[PDB]
Design a protein around this ligand. Structure first.
Ligand code: CA
Ligand code: CA
Ligand code: CA
Lengths: 358, 358, 358
């Protein structure tokens, strides 16, 4: 395309002061800079690269067809939650995998969704704001299937009364979590048939094709380079800031991940198209909940690393109410600003409980 | 009727190879056959007898009237869950009573209901499939009254902190469970007035009358003969198969019980009448939940046998999500196949958690 | 007004035999009467004074305007739950504050609401009974925000496994409860703008003005005089009746408090206006849940008294099901008598569990 949209669209992001963070993460590695600065200049280097992957992926959709063009249009908003989950599972920091994959479900149900209803409720306060229910009820049937897979290994850990030690109940949680994962991958392959082929009918570009595959390695081998620096240097970056590792992982780190889905769900909220702001905010809390999370169990199954679906007692109660307050909000096909301020303030309640949790 | 429908309708079951299991359970008793074979040839002998009672009971409805013909039409699908619960309560195997009466609630909410939506969604994928909400909302108000009676004696067992030993909190669970049962029998007598008399309007035969009372003892004193053999020989039949007694009782045994309600809820799903497949699958999880279960407490109250509504922590969390995922599925009066595959896969999640639970 | 409605309207209460209980509480103080009688003649002295405040407050609404006349019309039904909560927090009986503010949420969701549907369902059984959903969905979004603030300090108390003693986890519950309260007062100030100003349009008197301020001190300094006698003499009045202090506080004491809201929600149920019986029964379980309860934490924050949002395990499970069975009842805008009998019998289940709880 003769180097024209290769310089303008790269400088055509609504956030573009974050591009000099990328040279100040490799150079600061080979100079002996202390580890909080490498952590500060790696989150600010993945924030436009989480968008430039999740925008240029749509540019390859117009060169494939109707089948794959319904798949890659709705599967690569989560190409940063996947790389950080695998470059922390192989580094044996298994707890950070359980928080960043939980904070990407809560941010897509409370902060992303409850800003499309608030900011796109005040601008359109003198119009009627309608979406459809049948298009986004399937996204809540699957999250209640995911919650049952997280509830049951939690309650097995509190069965120490029943004449069993810890070595029995730990290989009982680990056996049923490695069997719930195959059941969770089947209710997402079936979802990717209902959404694409069977019920499609009830449901131009600017860039050349050869550009779209060159950059989507040049914007992926830089996410995989910086996702090591976030994982391998999160401990000293949690002792010089006086923050907990169960707050950086669950609150600050999903903001870098879900920043592509958080300017697409808001711009289509000012345009009064809330069918689209519910496809981005809900259809990406299902890909995390039922394809990205049970795939980590299967990769741990192969590598010999122990990992089960036990998040914890305080993390599961936040997951249970996030699905119930979202379901009762979206059950009549009409919205206003007070539906979205209740979802924001339920996210400032979770964000206090982990700021104190030391 | 001159021995004509007495030989044709008896041979007129869609499952009729299970009739020679009945002679091979009495003869194998008086020959010293080892106890797994008596257990194998007793479940296969109760499967057509759970249907021939729950079909010939409708034949007596056309000889009584409108009042009783709305009662016996909807009260004797559960004439096998009642005999096995009483022929195990008097044999002091109280735990098997708590599993088989729970696995008859889960099978009617997930496996019976989620097959009428899946098998009757693929055949009618090119039509619109509608039921009514007001006819089956009362069935969920009562199950939330039943769940509160099971939640509260569970949480009293975890109040050992409050300066009370086990002998105090065991006669505190036992006192409130014997008072919740009278409150549960009143919200089912009131349901049998709302359904029959007060709101009836908003809601031929082939066999003679004298045939219909002869067989309905000859098909009931054979259920009561074989329900002893299932109860008194479940222990050695759980050591020669390497299965748990909390899997045989909760999964394999309700399949023999709910096999009359599992070919009537499916044939009316191919006929695109989902008002009727929701009256069989939901109106029989309410008779178990609010008439068969609180009647066992009252019979234990009279016989001096200690029994309360405490199922357990792992069994109550499966009961809580089964009511919530069923309520959010049925709240718009329209169905398709993906609503029923989520209910089947939530039953293959419960069936793993108890296959491992040794 | 020349002493005419000052004698007729004071004698114009539908309960007026309870007025001689007021002289028999001050005289019995200065005569050495034993403390159960002062407790018996103080609940019967606050029952017409909980009504005469919550009726004459509407008489001052017609002398202020549209703004304040939407506020005092809906903020002083709870002028007795507030005085008893503060005259027990300063007397260091902190547990009674946690029960009487819980039994005012349960009575407004089950006993007040489930009598407007039952008594106003039998009188209007031959008509169709409709309310609106959008007017009373906001009242359930806020109660799910209140429940998350009560769920999370409960689960922190069961984190004694995580290498922390009791002195760590008690100043961890106390820190997050004093930060959840500011988040709860903001989602009620925002509710008092949505209800009054922004969405008003989608949503004579008999007494002079100068009468309305004289009596509303003369009916408030008698509530504050008798609310000391209920608090300071509840212990011996729970040893001469053989009742628990977690039954008098949660069942018998809210009946005196919610007796103004329990003849206004019933008379508008016989008149077939269920938009109004849902504004009294639901809009007063939100003022308790999100303005009266988080204000007690802030007053305890200033006075140096330790108080957090931890009610208990058995009290939170009763709060969780009370919101779920109320939400599934009111989701179609139509009512009948069987919706209200299920809500009454769920209140006779809570009232047994605390009658035994000694
Ligand atoms: Ca993302
Ligand atoms: Ca049955
Ligand atoms: Ca009140």
């Amino acid at each position: 395309d003769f180097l024209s949209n290769l310089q303008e669209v790269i400088l055509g992001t609504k956030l573009a002061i974050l591009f000099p963070a990328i040279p100040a993460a490799i150079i600061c590695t080979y100079c002996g800079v202390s580890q909080p600065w490498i952590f500060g200049l790696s989150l600010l280097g993945l924030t436009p690269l989480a968008e430039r992957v999740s925008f240029l992926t749509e540019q390859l959709a117009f060169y494939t067809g109707p089948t794959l063009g319904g798949l890659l249009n709705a599967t690569c908003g989560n190409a940063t939650e996947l790389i950080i989950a695998i470059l922390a599972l192989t580094n044996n920091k298994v707890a950070v995998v359980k928080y960043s994959l939980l904070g990407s479900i809560l941010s897509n149900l409370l902060l992303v969704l409850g800003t499309s209803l608030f900011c796109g409720g005040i601008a359109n306060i003198r119009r009627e704001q309608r979406f459809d229910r049948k298009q986004a009820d399937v996204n809540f049937f699957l999250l209640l299937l995911g919650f049952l897979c997280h509830l049951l290994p939690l309650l097995v850990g509190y069965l120490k009364n029943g004449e069993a030690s810890a070595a029995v109940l730990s290989d009982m949680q680990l056996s049923i979590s490695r069997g719930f994962s195959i059941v969770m991958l089947i209710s997402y392959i079936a979802y990717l048939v209902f959404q694409l082929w069977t019920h499609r009918q009830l449901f131009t570009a600017v860039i050349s094709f050869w550009s779209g595959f060159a950059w989507l390695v040049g914007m992926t081998l830089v996410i995989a380079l910086l996702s090591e620096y976030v994982v391998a240097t999160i401990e000293e970056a949690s002792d010089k800031w006086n923050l907990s590792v169960s707050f950086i992982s669950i609150i600050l780190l999903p903001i870098v991940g879900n920043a592509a889905e958080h300017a697409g769900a808001v711009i289509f909220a000012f345009k009064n198209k809330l069918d689209i702001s519910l496809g981005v905010a809900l259809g990406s809390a299902t890909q995390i909940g039922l394809f990205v999370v049970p795939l980590t169990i299967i990769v741990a199954w192969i590598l010999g690393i122990n990992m089960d679906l036990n998040f914890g007692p305080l993390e599961t109660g936040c997951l249970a109410v996030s699905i119930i307050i979202t379901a009762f909000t979206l059950q009549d096909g009409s919205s206003h600003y007070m539906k979205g301020l209740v979802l924001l303030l339920c996210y400032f309640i979770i964000a206090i409980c982990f700021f104190v949790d030391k």
